[PDB]
Amino acid sequence: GIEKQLQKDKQVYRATHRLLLLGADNSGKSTIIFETKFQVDKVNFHMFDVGGQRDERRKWIQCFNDVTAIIFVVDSSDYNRLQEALNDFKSIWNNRWLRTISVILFLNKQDLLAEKVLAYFPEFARYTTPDPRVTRAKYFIRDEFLRISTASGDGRHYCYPHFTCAVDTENARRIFNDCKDIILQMNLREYNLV
Amino acid sequence: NQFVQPAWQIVLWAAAYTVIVVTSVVGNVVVMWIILAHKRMRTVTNYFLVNLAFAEASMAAFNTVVNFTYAVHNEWYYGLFYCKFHNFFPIAAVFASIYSMTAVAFDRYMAIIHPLQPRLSATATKVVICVIWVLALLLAFPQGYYSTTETMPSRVVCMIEWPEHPNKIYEKVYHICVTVLIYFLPLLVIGYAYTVVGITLWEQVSAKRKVVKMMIVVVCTFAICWLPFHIFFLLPYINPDLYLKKFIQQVYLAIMWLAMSSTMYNPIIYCCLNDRFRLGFKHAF
Amino acid sequence: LKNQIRDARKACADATLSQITNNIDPVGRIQMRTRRTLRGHLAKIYAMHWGTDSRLLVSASQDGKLIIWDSYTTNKVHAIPLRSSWVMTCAYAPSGNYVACGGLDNICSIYNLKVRVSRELAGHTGYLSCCRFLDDNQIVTSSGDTTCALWDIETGQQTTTFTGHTGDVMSLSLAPDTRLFVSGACDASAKLWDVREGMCRQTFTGHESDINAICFFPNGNAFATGSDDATCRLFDLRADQELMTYSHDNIICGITSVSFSKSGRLLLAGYDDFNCNVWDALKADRAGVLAGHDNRVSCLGVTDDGMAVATGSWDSFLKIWN
Amino acid sequence: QFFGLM
Amino acid sequence: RKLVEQLKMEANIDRIKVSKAAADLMAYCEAHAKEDPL
Amino acid sequence: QVQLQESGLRLSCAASGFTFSNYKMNWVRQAPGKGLEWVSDISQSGASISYTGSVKGRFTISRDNAKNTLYLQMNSLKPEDTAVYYCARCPAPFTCFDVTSTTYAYRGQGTQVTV
């Protein structure tokens, strides 16, 4: 009865969706290797944070080809460290083994950004918005990532921007809705409807 | 002999029935070849589609050809064994087709409404297909077992010969059970599922509007194409006086064309919605 | 000082490899069919090794299942749930009583076949990539932190730590003499080590990208390399120069697994075009295409007696070809 | 009588 | 300092002729034709 | 053996030991007191060219395959550009992660540039 015990464990593989978390040291990845698990709407999500390996990531990231979503958390307050986040986002979006799955984008510590702007990019001056200053700053930060995300590979996978701070507590429902939309579009592709 | 129709009407019905059987069997066997031959579209998700295509092809070919060649002059040409075979198997093909549409609608509802819940395994899919076919043959068995070929002056008839009752209870209860299990409950299930899915799912938004409009077409054409079939097959237990002339022959031929018009629709829907199905219909011809 | 090495290798260039292989007939077309198909894996698999008895093989998957199968009957004899889901290597012991595994959890777990975990090796800072058994007492492991390590399982401490690489180490191969081993890394350099001396012997730099797989020739005096620049190269240990370049203009994809046969004539390589290739090791010519997988081939292993070959891609299917 | 069939 | 010393130690090696290695590879390849199942 | 040698105000990076027109090359800088930072990239065809915003619209990066070398042209310099300049290559051909790394195997030792 070895094969009989596996099939029930097959359900244990199928009811749980895995998530891959990235970011940097300054971004609050912990407050949103390390493993965490959380159940929303009686659906279990099980999120991974790989932080024991070296800085070279071109080999072990191939292990995350079949993960449901990649949560990319970006520090937005410190303007000198956005360009590394843009380069990492472009490299992730243009990867051969990561082009199928999608990236949920979190822009962390928004209150710190508001406190900094209420006290690098030469194209910021000729930009118009699609308390009035913070909206222009926030959607500049959003649009600089979305031009990369919509530059190529828009049909295979999407990007879901999100504005959040460290004192937020509702990110679970938002990532639940994002994963529901991603798997809904995947099911619509798999069922000969679109 | 009655029901000896003139030649021009037989030519017109023969042309219409030939067109419908050719397009139905061509579409269904092409759907077979695309799903089961390409091996990248071969998925647990499409097993219900293969079962539906098989039941629709069996419907079209066997049921439509033998009923039309019987009902042109009301003279049976195939003997009592094939009379039993036609009273048994194509009715089960019809029943399994409607139940496979119900299973496809259930899969689409439970997927679109609940995408985070996992899809059913190949074991449960095979069990559902087996239960569909066993219940279809079990419901078509009383017509197959009670079939009888009888000889009249210049006439040979394949008829269901139930044991006689003073109130005609047995065939009336059987046809009422067939009606409530074949027209009412799957229509209610597919209507509730497609209503909830269309309400939830109503650029890529135009594909969603196309999907909702197409399932509206599916529900409406199922109700329209399967109303007069059950209406006529429940007619002789209410108004039995309408079987004097060839008017009931014309009514039977018209409702058989309208009921077998529902075979063509699923290849048309799959060609209109999906792109790889359009590539498959382009590659086959 | 390496310019003198380059001048010495240029002076050692007497003739090409194909100049000496002219007086023999080519092999021709080599074709195989999937004798057994294994469908018991749930998620993607990454690694595989053949036993010395040529009957039982072991498969490692990323869902946390390490399954030892039976190749004759196409059935599982053992199925071990793993502590960490992410593994990248496995090896089945020549005595058949042990199987090792390792991955991103920085642990080289050893499993006894006489099923529970025996011991857990924790000395590597990076992800493990390849491990192979010398004997039942000592094992050689390689990690992505530029370190190979000789472990004694009886004490669980490193005997010799091989540190001569600059890129992440992907694969190692064991000589038939069980005294030297060659290892390839992500710096376009594969090099030989001595397990007794604890130091590197020779360094071979011929490729242009990351070396992903390596295997010894059956005589122990040559090795073939596979890398991401869609080429293979055969190197000799004594000559220390490139012999043949198995490359084609119609392939631009990576190479993940290589292996040799019993005779060494057929070099079997797993590519990234969803299909494997077989190569004549002397003619440097294409012999056939092994196309039976729907995903990219990650593991490939040839039996010692050469009666079968097993091949896996990440589509959770193991295929024996013969 | 007609004796139609399903 | 360690890399230069390693490369200097690896510079002083004995290299046989490439045609000799080709001949030895030829001899081992043609010496095991009957034990090759492919 | 791969080898990248920098020289140079116009920067010239020489590449040898590998095929040239199949890889996407990068320029990175190392200012003292901080980590590395990406400057500009060039593709195989030389069409997809991007720069850092702090140096955008000022530098001219170019590649010629016949000379098998990479060029960078600078005008209107700033005192913030005093850094060590490495030419880098991400390893996968026909395609790119680890060029901004502490240890890398496909980039040169760099040249120090001060105004």
How many angstroms away from the CA of C216 is the closest CA of chain F? 22
For chain B, how many structural domains are there in total?
1
Angstrom distances, CA of residue B204 to CA of B35, B199, B208, B211, C259: 25, 17, 7, 11, 47
A6, HSE (Cβ side, Cα atoms, 13 Å): 18
Within-domain flag for B1: no
- Residues making up the annotated binding site of B for CP-96345 are 175
Task: Supply the DSSP symbol for F105.
Answer: S
Pairing of strands A159-163, A102-108: parallel
Angstrom distances, CA of residue C217 to CA of A144, A160, C311, E28, F29: 53, 51, 19, 10, 44
Cβ-based contacts of A127 with chain F (< 8 Å) = none
CB-closest option in A43, A183, A190 to B45: A190
Residues of D with CB under 8 A from a CB of B: 1-6
Radius of gyration, alpha carbons of chain A: 18
Amino acid at the residue A173: R
CA–chain centroid gap for B118, Å, is 30
Query: Which of B106, B108, B116 is best to mutate for the A interface (most A CBs within 10 A)?
Result: B116
Q: How far apart are CA A157 and CA A81, in angstroms?
A: 26
CA–chain centroid gap for B205, Å, is 32
User: Is C97 an interface residue toward F (CB < 8 Å)?
Assistant: no
Q: Which helix (H) or strand (E) segment is A71 a member of?
A: strand A69-75
Is the separation of the CB atoms in B84 and B147 below 8 Å? yes
Residue with tokens 């429940």: B234
Terminal CA-to-CA distance of chain E, rounded, Å?
49
Residue B54: domain span: 7-284
String of b and e for C66-96 (b: at least 16 CB within 10 Å)? bbbbebeeeebebbbebebbbbbbbbbbbeb
Cβ neighbours of residue C11 closer than 8 Å, sequence gap 6 or more = none
Within-domain flag for B151: yes
How many angstroms away from the CA of B26 is the closest CA of chain D? 23
Q: Which two tokens stand for residue C121?
A: 């090796």
Contact C1 E8 (CB under 8 A): yes
Contact F100 A84 (CB under 8 A): yes
Which among B145, B40, B139, B57 has a CA at the least distance from the CA of B97?
B57
- What is the CATH number for B92? 1.20.1070.10
For chain F, how many structural domains are there in total?
1
Neighbours of B276 (CB within 10 A): 13
Contact A87 F100 (CB under 8 A): yes
Is the separation of the CB atoms in C304 and C50 below 8 Å? yes
B-D contacts at Cβ under 8 angstroms: 31
Three-state DSSP class for residue A34? strand
Q: Which domains does chain C carry?
A: 1-321 (2.130.10.10)
Q: How far apart are CA C247 and CA A137, in angstroms?
A: 52
A-C contacts at Cβ under 8 angstroms: 55
Contacts 24+ apart (CB under 8 A), B268-273: B268/B27, B269/B214, B269/B217, B269/B218, B270/A192, B270/B31, B272/B214, B273/A192, B273/A193, B273/A194, B273/B210, B273/B211, B273/B214
User: Is A55 an interface residue toward F (CB < 8 Å)?
Assistant: yes
Within-domain flag for B229: yes
Task: Supply the DSSP string of A117-150, one letter for each residue.
Answer: HT---TTSTT-----HHHHHHHHHHHHHHHHHHT
How many angstroms away from the CA of A159 is the closest CA of chain F? 20
> Helices A171-190 and B79-112 meet at what angle, rounded to 10?
150
- What is the CATH number for A74? 3.40.50.300
A-B contacts at Cβ under 8 angstroms: 51
Is the separation of the CB atoms in C202 and C181 below 8 Å? no
User: Is A33 an interface residue toward C (CB < 8 Å)?
Assistant: yes
Q: Which two tokens stand for residue C78?
A: 């053992």
For chain A, how many structural domains are there in total?
1
Is the separation of the CB atoms in F40 and F51 below 8 Å? yes
**Order of all β-strands in the sheet with C169-174:** C169-174, C180-185, C190-194, C200-204
Q: How far apart are CA B121 and CA C170, in angstroms?
A: 37
Q: Write the secondary structure of chain C as one string of H (helix), E (strand) and C (coil).
A: CHHHHHHHHHHCCCCCHHHHCCCCCCCCCCCCCEEEEECCCCCCEEEEEECCCCCCEEEEECCCEEEEEECCCCEEEEEEECCCCCEEEEEECCCCCEEEEEECCCCEEEEECCCCEEEEECCCCCCEEEEEECCCCEEEEEECCCCEEEEECCCCEEEEEECCCCCCEEEEEECCCCCEEEEEECCCCEEEEECCCCCEEEEECCCCCCEEEEEECCCCCEEEEEECCCEEEEEECCCCCEEEEEECCCCCCCEEEEEECCCCCEEEEEECCCCEEEEECCCCCEEEEECCCCCCEEEEEECCCCCCEEEEECCCCEEEEC
Three-state DSSP class for residue F51? strand
Three-state DSSP class for residue A11? helix
Residue with tokens 């290798």: C9
- What is the CATH number for F73? 2.60.40.10
- Residues making up the annotated binding site of B are 175
Q: How far apart are CA C184 and CA C197, in angstroms?
A: 19
Which among F95, F88, F89 has a CA at the least distance from the CA of F29?
F88
Report the phi/psi class of residue F34: left, alpha or beta, with left for phi > 0 and alpha for psi in -120 to 50: beta
Q: How far apart are CA A163 and CA A172, in angstroms?
A: 14
Q: Which domains does chain E carry?
A: 1-38 (4.10.260.10)
Q: Which two tokens stand for residue C64?
A: 């946390």
Task: Supply the DSSP string of F8-49, one letter for each residue.
Answer: --EEEEEEESS-STTS-EEEEEE-TTS-EEEEEEE-SSS--E
CA–chain centroid gap for B94, Å, is 4
Neighbours of B56 (CB within 10 A): 28
Vertex C183 angle, CA C182 and C185, to 5°: 155
Q: How far apart are CA C258 and CA B5, in angstroms?
A: 77
Three-state DSSP class for residue A1? coil
Q: How far apart are CA F108 and CA B206, in angstroms?
A: 53
Residue with tokens 């290589």: C258
Is the separation of the CB atoms in B28 and B61 below 8 Å? no
Residue A183: domain span: 2-190
Residue F104: domain span: 3-113
Is the separation of the CB atoms in C146 and C153 below 8 Å? no
Residues of C with CB under 8 A from a CB of A: 40, 42-44, 46, 62-63, 76, 79, 81, 86, 88, 104-106, 125-127, 144-145, 167-168, 170, 186, 210, 314
Neighbours of C39 (CB within 10 A): 9
Is the separation of the CB atoms in A162 and A104 below 8 Å? yes
CB-closest option in C14, C201, C322 to E19: C14
CB-closest option in A7, A180, A192 to B277: A192
User: Is E22 an interface residue toward C (CB < 8 Å)?
Assistant: yes
Task: Supply the DSSP symbol for A18.
Answer: E
Which among A24, A21, A7 has a CA at the least distance from the CA of A81?
A24
Q: Which two tokens stand for residue A177?
A: 């809705």
Pairing of strands C309-313, C297-302: antiparallel
Q: Which two tokens stand for residue F109?
A: 């030792």
Cβ neighbours of residue B283 closer than 8 Å, sequence gap 6 or more = none
Q: How far apart are CA C197 and CA C213, in angstroms?
A: 24
Contacts 24+ apart (CB under 8 A), B115-120: B115/A180, B115/A183, B115/A184, B115/A186, B115/A187, B116/A17, B116/A41, B116/A43, B116/A179, B116/A180, B116/A183, B117/A15, B117/A43, B118/A11, B118/A14, B118/A15, B119/A14, B119/B44, B119/B45, B120/B44
Hey, which chains touch F, using 3+ CB pairs under 8 Å? A, C
Task: Supply the DSSP string of A86-116, one letter for each residue.
Answer: HHHHHHHHT-SSSSSSEEEEEEE-HHHHHHH
**Do D and E share at least 3 CB pairs under 8 Å?**
no
Q: Which two tokens stand for residue B89?
A: 């198997």
Cβ-based contacts of C81 with chain A (< 8 Å) = 9
Q: Which two tokens stand for residue A178?
A: 């994002």
The dihedral through the CA atoms of C201, C205, C207, C209 has a sign that is positive
> Phi and psi (nearest 5°) for B150?
-120, 155
Task: Supply the DSSP symbol for F61.
Answer: E
Cβ neighbours of residue B220 closer than 8 Å, sequence gap 6 or more = none
| Nearest Cα residue in chain F from C229 | F93
How many angstroms away from the CA of F115 is the closest CA of chain A? 20
Which among C168, F97, F22 has a CA at the least distance from the CA of A96?
F97
Is the separation of the CB atoms in F46 and F39 below 8 Å? no
Is the separation of the CB atoms in C168 and C212 below 8 Å? no
User: Is E19 an interface residue toward C (CB < 8 Å)?
Assistant: yes
Angstrom distances, CA of residue A18 to CA of A67, A69, F12: 6, 8, 46
Q: How far apart are CA C253 and CA C231, in angstroms?
A: 9
Contact F95 A56 (CB under 8 A): no
Question: After which residues does a break in chain A occur, C–N more than 2.5 Å?
Answer: 32, 119, 130
Is the separation of the CB atoms in C126 and A50 below 8 Å? no
Contact D6 B233 (CB under 8 A): yes
